[PDB]
Design a protein around this ligand. Structure first.
Ligand SMILES: O=P([O-])([O-])OC[C@@H](O)CO
Ligand SMILES: [Mn+2]
Length: 424
């Protein structure tokens, strides 16, 4: 069993990259704000419906002219855990499980998570804010194992009828109250805001909508337009509030969609919306969920690197100026020249710069046309993908961090974390 840990540690060594000297430690001890966009897909970026931009603010950020670096080729790598899978991978650089939810099933495993590393190395206090109750997706248990200090769940927000839609709190009230909670925190903090409104079935009260539905006839797709617009507006206003509170300029700010909102069940309506048949290759391309990052002292831009949510943890750690040689991680720093441009999907599909592998076939990214002559690096890349998923599963199924005496990590005591019921 310590042998099983050893094999995984050895496996993750070869991909390790040196930080880019232009980015290394540039955000040391700066506040880090992480904004989750529920069910957000980047096919929305620059999209118009009835002549109106669905997501006008994120369109500005995605221009590269607004202090954020946008990655248009950034993919979620989630499975059945949905939001919890995305959270898991964002804070651990490990995959979720092939079936079921790592949060629900591995909630008392041992972890060496991002928030705990930031606390230990640099005195970061961590928090999550979310307008649902704390035991959904077993977050109450899981976050103590991650070493998250505070969890502002639904009990920190007014959950009256006028304030809720679908699963709970409306994003505009969420961001407004959350900005006010962040303004009262001590620096350095690591704050994760998880939104809720842009969630299946994508229902929005008429009085809240500012764009009309598309007219595909598919209620899911047509509704998604309105909730996506609403989230875009909530976010624009949130960024405004940060600027007013003095929490914008000197914060690392990251924004990301957690996973796709529109499944292959809606291929008819998506063909109408996007004006193209939704083939398996095309659906794979639509799994782009986006990453936007603003780093103090650095200009924004567009970076076309193919990458996944596994790459976020090592990127943040290198921005903080933390040496990561001893962390068991599957991703690599987005800003390093050695970044590994292969993105495994939970189902064994994967994408690279040049081609994608989807249900046992290879397609060129240029045109999504079938490739018949195997690329030079295909067997190497396919093997990496398969071994990545298997090795990550070995960590979760063997609870392998139990056997790791890591010179750069003090074991978390989960009983030291408690999330009290809020005033609301
Ligand atoms: O996992 P899902 O269903 O996308 O997200 C739901 C939640 O985050 C609710 O708390
Ligand atoms: Mn989600």
């Amino acid at each position: 069993s310590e042998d099983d840990l050893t094999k995984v540690l050895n496996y993750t060594k070869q991909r390790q990259t040196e930080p880019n000297p232009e980015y290394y430690g540039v955000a040391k001890k700066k506040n880090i704000i992480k904004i989750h966009l529920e069910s957000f897909q980047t096919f929305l970026i620059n999209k118009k419906v009835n002549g109106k931009e669905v997501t006008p603010f994120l369109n500005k950020l995605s221009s590269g002219k607004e202090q954020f670096t946008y990655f248009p080729n950034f993919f979620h790598q989630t499975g059945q855990g949905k939001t919890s899978d995305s959270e898991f991978t964002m804070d651990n650089s490990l995959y979720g499980l092939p079936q079921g939810s790592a949060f629900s099933l591995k909630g008392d495993n041992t972890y060496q998570s991002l928030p705990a590393i930031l606390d230990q190395k640099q005195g970061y206090k961590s928090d999550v804010m979310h307008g649902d109750y704390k035991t959904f997706w077993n977050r109450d248990q899981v976050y103590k194992h991650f070493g998250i200090d505070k969890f502002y769940d639904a009990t920190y927000y007014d959950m009256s009828d006028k304030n809720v839609v679908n699963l709970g709190l409306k994003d505009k009230i969420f961001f407004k109250d959350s900005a006010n909670y962040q303004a009262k925190m001590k620096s350095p903090f690591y704050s994760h805001l998880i939104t809720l409104t842009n969630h299946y079935p994508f229902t929005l009260d008429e009085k809240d909508a500012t764009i009309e539905k598309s007219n595909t006839g598919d209620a899911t797709v047509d509704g998604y337009i309105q909730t996506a617009r609403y989230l875009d507006e909530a976010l624009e206003e949130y960024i405004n509030d940060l600027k007013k509170k003095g929490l914008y300029d000197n914060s690392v700010i990251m924004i990301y969609g957690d996973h796709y909102g529109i499944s292959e069940n809606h291929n008819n309506a998506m063909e109408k919306l996007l004006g193209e048949k939704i083939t398996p290759a095309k659906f794979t391309d639509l799994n782009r969920t986006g990453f936007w990052i603003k780093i103090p002292g650095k200009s924004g831009g567009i970076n076309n690197e193919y990458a996944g949510q596994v790459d976020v943890m090592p990127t943040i750690l290198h921005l903080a100026g933390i040496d990561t040689k001893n962390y068991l991680m599957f991703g690599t720093d987005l800003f390093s020249k050695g970044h590994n441009q292969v993105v495994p999907f939970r189902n064994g599909d994967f994408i690279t710069k040049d081609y994608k592998y989807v249900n046992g076939k290879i397609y060129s990214n240029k045109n999504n046309e079938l490739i018949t002559t195997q690329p030079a690096d295909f067997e190497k890349n396919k093997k990496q993908v398969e071994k990545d998923l298997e090795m990550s599963d070995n960590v979760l199924n063997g609870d392998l961090f139990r056997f790791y005496k890591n010179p750069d990590f003090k074991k978390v005591n989960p009983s030291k974390y408690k999330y009290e019921t809020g005033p609301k």
